[PDB]
């Protein structure tokens, strides 16, 4: 069933810590515990391995990433910027 | 301590061989003044402090 | 302790120039379906291991206990 | 004698209980017994041919 209405993963914290703080940690404990898809084998088997490490259980390949997501928005912007500058330099 | 060093066991051996009373013939000597063993040690009275 | 399942290997083992003593141990055992019989263990004392040959037939036991070398000291029981 | 009485079912009423139901026998243990019974029966039936794999796979998840 629906065990909890809105705390979700932060029902382990009970009534403590403050509701805003438990919301802020809920939105990142979902993110750091989600299974992500691998960019090398296509399977949704990427898990976090001590923040910054994201390891795929198939094919055993490990990517550096953000502390709670595989790809932060700053890093994706950096990847696009370096792609743009490399395409400008080598052409 | 049942796992001693030889230095501790050497001092323990000296203490064992010293843990004796006065010889009785020493009290019969000419101009004897020694009455008893005044450096006598027991394990229940004074710890020898290694 | 090692067990031999071979007769010729045992017999060349008794003449190894390190073996001085053997033992013939007689067990009063039971087979399957419980009939009493006479197991015989021949134990050769090598210099590193003791080798046991287990013979469940008294005819073969009598044959090998006579085929043992005469210079080798055999204990019984 | 008390063990034979307990096997016959005596000395197990409401006032002979000091631990909870889940303390006396866990609901997880009861569930594990049930699920292994149903999976054993389903695998026995599928390998005996009295159900096919397409009925077995429905009944596996429904069990």
């Amino acid at each position: 069933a629906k065990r909890t209405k809105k705390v979700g993963i932060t029902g382990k914290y009970g009534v403590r810590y403050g509701s805003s703080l438990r919301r802020q940690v809920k939105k990142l404990e979902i993110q750091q515990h989600a299974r992500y898809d691998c960019s090398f084998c296509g399977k949704k088997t990427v898990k976090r391995g001590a923040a910054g490490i994201w390891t795929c259980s198939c094919c055993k390949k490990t990517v550096a990433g953000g502390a709670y997501t595989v790809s932060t928005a700053a890093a994706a912007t950096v990847r696009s910027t370096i792609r743009r500058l490399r395409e400008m330099v080598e052409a | 301590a049942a796992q001693k060093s030889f230095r501790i066991k050497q001092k323990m051996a000296k203490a064992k061989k010293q843990n004796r009373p006065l010889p009785q013939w020493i009290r019969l000597r000419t101009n004897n003044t020694i009455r008893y063993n005044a450096k006598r040690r027991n394990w229940r009275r004074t710890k020898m402090n290694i | 302790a090692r067990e031999i399942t071979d007769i010729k290997q045992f017999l060349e083992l008794t003449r190894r120039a390190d073996v001085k003593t053997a033992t013939v141990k007689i067990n009063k055992k039971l087979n399957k379906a419980g009939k009493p019989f006479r197991q015989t263990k021949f134990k050769v004392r090598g210099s590193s291991s003791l080798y046991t040959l287990v013979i469940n037939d008294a005819g073969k036991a009598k044959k090998l206990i006579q085929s043992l070398p005469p210079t080798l000291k055999v204990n019984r029981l | 004698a008390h063990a034979q009485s307990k096997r016959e079912g005596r000395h197990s009423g409401y006032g002979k209980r000091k631990g909870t139901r889940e303390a006396r026998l866990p609901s997880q243990v009861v569930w594990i017994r049930r699920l292994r019974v149903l999976r054993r029966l389903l695998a026995k039936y599928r390998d005996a041919g009295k159900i096919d794999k397409h009925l077995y796979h429905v009944l596996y998840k429904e069990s």
């Binding site: 810590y17 802020q24 990517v63 550096a64 500058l85 | - | - | -």
Partner: protein
């Protein structure tokens, strides 16, 4: 009358780092002929977790140019590098994420990390997690490169100082609340003994400049001179302004 707690940290008795579990000093490869004239290919073999550090470390194995062996370097992993990735380090390296190439041989607006202050000191700037240095300038007549540091500071580095393309991995770490002193305890247990912090106003006057009184107050001004001496500097040292950052 007593030596105070910030003064006691320089003797370094209990205030040393807790460096048992750390993988090594995360440094760039040493500046040799290969890195100075061409490039050298290494291989990422592990992305490991450093203890007391918020960012992962890439154990990148190169070949030693002069002796047949393998030289393992410990880089700070930029966000996007993976195991089995070839890392190309040197002047003739290409502009890919993870490559280690000088600030003279990159375009304007390039985003680097683990970037040096002097050419050959093996990584100094933008090494914490999520941090990066933007390359805003070049000055080829004096071999300089204007960069923007993570603090907003504009700095002029040599164009032969190196940097690793990308942002440092482990970004967004501080966005999660620690929620409890247990999480802060285990945070600082592998860094150093800088926690828990007693406030100086809770102390006695012998323990701190702020201590004492029948009410917990500071008494004198918290803004202390830069030319003040060791023992007085317990407050806001050399503060240009105070209060909230509003206008």
């Amino acid at each position: 009358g007593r030596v105070i707690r910030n003064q006691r940290k320089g003797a370094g008795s209990i205030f040393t780092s807790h460096t048992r579990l750390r993988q090594g000093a995360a440094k760039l490869r040493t500046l040799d002929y290969a890195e100075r004239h061409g490039y050298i290919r290494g291989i990422v073999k592990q992305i490991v977790h450093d203890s007391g550090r918020g960012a992962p470390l890439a154990k990148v194995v190169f070949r030693d140019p002069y002796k047949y062996r393998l030289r393992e370097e410990i880089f700070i992993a930029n966000e996007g590098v993976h195991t089995g990735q070839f890392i190309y380090a040197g002047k003739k390296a290409s502009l890919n994420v993870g490559n280690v190439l000088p600030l003279g041989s990159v375009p304007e607006g390039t985003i680097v990390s683990n970037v040096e202050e002097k050419p050959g000191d093996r990584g100094a700037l933008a090494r914490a997690s999520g941090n990066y240095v933007i390359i805003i300038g070049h000055n080829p007549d004096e071999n300089k490169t204007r960069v923007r540091l993570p603090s907003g500071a504009k700095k002029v580095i040599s164009s032969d100082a190196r940097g690793v393309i990308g942002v440092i991995a482990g970004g967004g770490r501080v966005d999660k609340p620690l929620l409890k002193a247990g999480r802060a305890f285990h945070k600082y247990r592998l860094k150093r003994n800088s926690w828990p912090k007693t406030r100086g106003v809770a102390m006695n006057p012998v323990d701190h400049p702020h201590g004492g009184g029948n009410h917990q107050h500071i008494g004198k001004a918290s803004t202390i001179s830069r030319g003040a001496v060791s023992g007085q500097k317990a407050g806001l040292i050399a503060a240009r302004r105070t209060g909230l950052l509003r206008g």
